[PDB]
Symmetry: C3
Subunit: 148 residues, 3 copies
């Protein structure tokens, strides 16, 4: 049928005195992500991928990050699209994200009204390269498939 | 239902004395993108996603950067030729999505025009083409405005 | 029907002293990746991602070369109920020239995934002398995969 794909990218600086919140999960860490919102880099990337797949523009032209993700899903449905799946990658040199992946997936699935088997989150370091490798920021990438 | 996906990446240095042309739009700006062609980073990314979805290789294979015939080339002409070869290979384009990442200038005012150019070149309606603009949150060579990056995704069907 | 998309990313440092293996192909160069097959890793991640099976680190704990890992990945994706429809990818390396080796990489990947050659694509890019990629300090790979349940 009328399938569409979307792709999303986000990055935020890591700064002192902020909670680290990724995929809705508060992760123990001495620094957190800097932004106007709670700076949830993963949710932002997914949001952009979903807007992209529905050809609805981007997060900047539309607008915590879970409320924003829920609103994104609403606007995607309003345009006549159903979400089929989401995949994503977080790139962070530190801290370890593996123990938190399942909770992120559950959060995203709940926000998008999707079963768990249609949401994926993957974790990577940057092999100590560049600003990500120096722990100056955290990047997220996302892909979304929808159908009209 | 023989769907295929493709993805594209491009980056170019931002330098004085070149036109800034992104998504086919000439943007008023003191610097422009450096390349053999008009260096349209967004159109190149989309071109690569389309060739990739059709398993036809990449922009270098089809349009050589060492070939003088492409010096200052209009990247919309390249995108249209790509679309023609994708069609010849038996594929129809279903949608395109993309991201441009730049510290400056502001791209929001130009996005609709880029979308319209890409839609024209691909013979798509506007509602199957998307362009997203952002900054790199001050990080890295993108944060320092040394270059501009584009990412693209395309869905086709044979 | 029940299509899903997946995406993958990988990067490795590029220094003298190790061989350069990308897409199962050994490429002569003064530097190598710290088998560190960046392209196969990205594709593996995209496949696990499309199947919503997590990632390469969850399946294959560092606690076998990258082609063996790719083959096992494909087996798990199949058992989870998914057929692979296509793979596309990009390698970003300032040097050496990767174009001569593309068909060899595609052949290795198609073999490992039991796919027709025309459903596997690999693209090559430089980083226009920008960043650690542009300075030849590492090589990046990006991948996209489409599957169907
Ligand atoms: C205002 C809250 O949402 C937004 O518009 C967002 S989310 C986001 N991530 C990097 C920049 N950015 C902006 C401007
Ligand atoms: C010259 C038109 O097509 C090409 O070959 C292109 S487009 C392009 N963008 C960055 C490098 N590059 C090359 C080598
Ligand atoms: C055992 C092979 O799989 C892995 O865990 C991999 S693949 C890989 N590429 C960069 C880091 N990295 C790790 C930790
Ligand atoms: Cl920036
Ligand atoms: K990148
Ligand atoms: Zn953000
Ligand atoms: Zn280019
Ligand atoms: Zn790797």
């Amino acid at each position: 049928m009328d399938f569409r794909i979307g792709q999303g990218y986000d990055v935020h600086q890591l700064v002192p005195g902020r909670p680290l919140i990724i995929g809705g999960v508060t992760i123990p860490y001495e620094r957190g992500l800097l932004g106007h919102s709670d700076a949830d880099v993963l949710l932002h990337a997914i949001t952009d991928a979903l807007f992209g797949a529905a050809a609805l523009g981007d997060i900047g032209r539309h607008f915590d990050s879970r409320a924003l993700l829920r609103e994104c899903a609403s606007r995607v449905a309003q345009a006549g699209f159903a979400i089929r799946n989401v995949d994503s990658t977080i790139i962070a040199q530190a801290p370890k994200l593996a123990p938190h992946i399942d909770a992120m997936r559950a959060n995203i699935a709940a926000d998008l009204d999707l079963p768990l088997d249609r949401v994926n989150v993957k974790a990577k370091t940057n092999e100590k390269l560049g600003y990500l490798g120096r722990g100056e920021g955290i990047e997220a990438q996302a892909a979304a498939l929808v159908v009209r």
